[PDB]
């Protein structure tokens, strides 16, 4: 209702860099809020695409941002009569970025990896990797839980079980309040998908440069399955955390599997041991139900609610015709040990090919009425398809079907305005939480400030 659309601030990255593909607010030890921006096609120092991360300090006028440095040199280690190899070309550093405390975690989901042993190899494959940075000290670490040293043959001899070679770890990422980093790796276990968890502290304390294969003993990965429903499900395409078992001592994980069960799609709520607590099934095949997941209490009862996006959902229309518009499903959490039932509200896009529900951002309490609010991206929405972001205020009954406000893209066609969103943080210290929107197609990010 009260995000100011007139006085925008534009931060810009380099041409072709996809600056804005991912973003987050970052708060230093002093308390000063900056904006972390991921730019997964930024050219490295040798004119080869590696991706990058930029740390933007808050200004009303916006502008260019400084690059947060990372090692972009490939590594080789001849150890244990083997040859370990990392490959950072086209790795897409900054395909996801997330901040926790004084740490920034930026991931390269497509960083490739290989192991050679005489005439055999593991196969050069995208295990992915995350780089961890602590700006105020300069410390750097890495986490790459899917790297192995098993040769191609052994996988074949074991019917490709526990095959983590194509994980793409860090495809999605979230961090708990306690400091556990959770990575989505939708290529895990031969494209079933997996989750990797490890405490940020332990990632830092177990990392040394040049080792490439090391142990993080506190880490916890999800499991492989021979259940065909899970095959090619891309479990971990999106990830999120919240409270869903009424036990504040334990944290629950929300996982998106948009092609689960022959493209039916699914989202699962799990405990921290990866035991399924509930499964929400998609409504329509190929709708990509689970592309986006958001957790936030929207009806003011202090129980986290679940929001799922299906951006390729096709709506029924007159004379048996279907129209790709996208849908968002709201699930309100009930009391006790009771399951999440059917959707309390379906929000459906209105522009053809708009991809409404491609991103869902909790905004916190935007208007300060007591109920939390959300924004929902339609990256190709609006009458001219340039992109659109729609604000929905919360209420006792859940959310309103009608948006309180609509933000039209200020960028040209193809910008993918809204493809990434983040809220719930007051960047300018005015007492109201603001909204950062990324338009990776236009290599920019737009900040919207909430006003009284």
């Amino acid at each position, epitope marked *: 209702l009260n995000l100011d659309p007139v006085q925008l601030t534009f931060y810009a990255g380099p041409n072709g860099s996809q600056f804005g593909f991912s973003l987050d607010f970052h708060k230093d030890s002093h308390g000063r809020v900056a904006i972390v921006v991921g730019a997964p096609r930024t050219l490295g120092p040798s004119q080869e695409e590696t991706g990058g991360v930029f740390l933007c300090p808050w200004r009303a006028e916006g502008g260019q941002c400084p690059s947060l440095l990372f090692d972009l040199r490939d590594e080789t*280690r001849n*150890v*244990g009569s083997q040859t370990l190899q990392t490959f950072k070309a086209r790795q897409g550093l900054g395909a996801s970025v997330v901040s926790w405390s004084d740490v920034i975690v930026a991931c390269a989901p497509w960083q490739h990896w290989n192991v050679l042993e005489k005439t055999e190899e593991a196969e050069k494959t995208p295990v992915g990797s995350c780089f961890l940075a602590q700006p105020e000290s300069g410390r750097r670490a890495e986490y790459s839980p899917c790297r192995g040293n098993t040769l191609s043959r052994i996988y074949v001899e074991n019917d490709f079980s526990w095959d983590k070679r194509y994980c793409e770890a860090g495809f999605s990422s979230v961090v708990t309040q306690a400091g556990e980093l959770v990575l989505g790796a939708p290529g895990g276990y031969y494209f079933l998908g997996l989750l990797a968890q490890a405490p940020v502290a332990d990632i830092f304390s177990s990392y*040394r440069p*040049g*080792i490439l*294969l*090391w*142990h993080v*003993s506190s880490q916890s990965l999800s499991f492989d399955s021979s259940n065909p429903e899970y095959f090619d499900g891309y479990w971990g395409y999106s990830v999120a955390v919240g409270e869903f078992d009424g036990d504040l001592n334990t944290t629950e994980y929300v996982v998106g599997a948009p092609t689960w069960s022959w493209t039916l799609g699914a989202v699962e709520i799990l405990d921290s041991y990866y035991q399924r607590l509930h499964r929400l099934r998609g409504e329509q095949m190929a709708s990509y139900f689970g592309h986006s997941v958001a957790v936030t209490d929207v009806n003011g009862d202090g129980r986290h609610d679940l929001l799922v996006g299906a951006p390729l959902y096709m709506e029924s229309r007159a004379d048996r015709k279907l129209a790709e518009v996208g849908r968002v499903y709201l699930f309100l959490q009930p009391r006790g040990p009771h399951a999440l039932g059917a959707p309390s509200l379906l929000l459906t896009g209105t522009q053809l090919y708009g991809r409404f529900g491609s991103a869902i951002a909790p905004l916190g309490d935007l208007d300060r009425d007591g109920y939390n609010d959300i924004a929902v991206a339609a990256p190709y929405g609006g009458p001219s398809g340039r992109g659109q972001v729609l604000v929905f205020l919360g209420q006792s009954e859940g959310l309103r079907s009608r948006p309180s406000q609509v933000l039209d893209s200020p960028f040209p066609t193809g910008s993918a305005f809204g493809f990434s969103l983040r809220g719930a943080v007051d960047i300018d210290d005015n007492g109201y939480p603001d909204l950062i929107v990324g338009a990776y197609g236009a290599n920019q990010v737009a900040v919207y400030r909430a006003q009284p």
Partner: antibody
Amino acid sequence: EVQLQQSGAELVKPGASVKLSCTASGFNIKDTYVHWVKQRPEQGLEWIGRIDPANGYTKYDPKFQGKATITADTSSNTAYLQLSSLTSEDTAVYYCVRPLYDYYAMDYWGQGTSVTVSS
Amino acid sequence: DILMTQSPSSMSVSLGDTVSITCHASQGISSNIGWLQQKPGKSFMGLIYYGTNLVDGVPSRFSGSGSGADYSLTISSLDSEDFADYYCVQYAQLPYTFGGGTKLEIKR
């Protein structure tokens, strides 16, 4: 606290077998490679082999191929070394070992098991 | 197999000295070298992994260095507890191989 707890001293006879054990404490045995090492006053430290207790796959120094069999059991969090066809050369102290962080390193060591081969 | 030649086999040193034990590999092992300590009648404790990284808990007075086929362990300002045996192990290639050992002994 990570700690490797080996089985007690062995007095065995030449031509017989013996099976030493090494049990994980404060961690799970499948977490890393587990190695076995031989020490003798004169000849010094010799690497015998290793097991990946998650999947059972092993590697040996050819010097011990045939004599040594390394196994592991994740049920009991224990790794074993079995020596067949015992001789006076097998009189030594035997250690199980694992890395701290680096997959390939040799950082944490058991207290050692003493084996005396004698008629 | 890679041969690890450690030097010296013993040295007579005093409290507060700074000493170095060298280890020569028979081929390049690119820092895939660990250093171990065995105190009298006791078992082994790891000191350094991958050439220069101290194992958790190990005192800062221990340091590692080198490259290619030639490495060193330096103990700055010796302590009573530091009169022990020390060994290098390479893990560049299986089979892992060990140095002969260096014994630190008290000068009198």
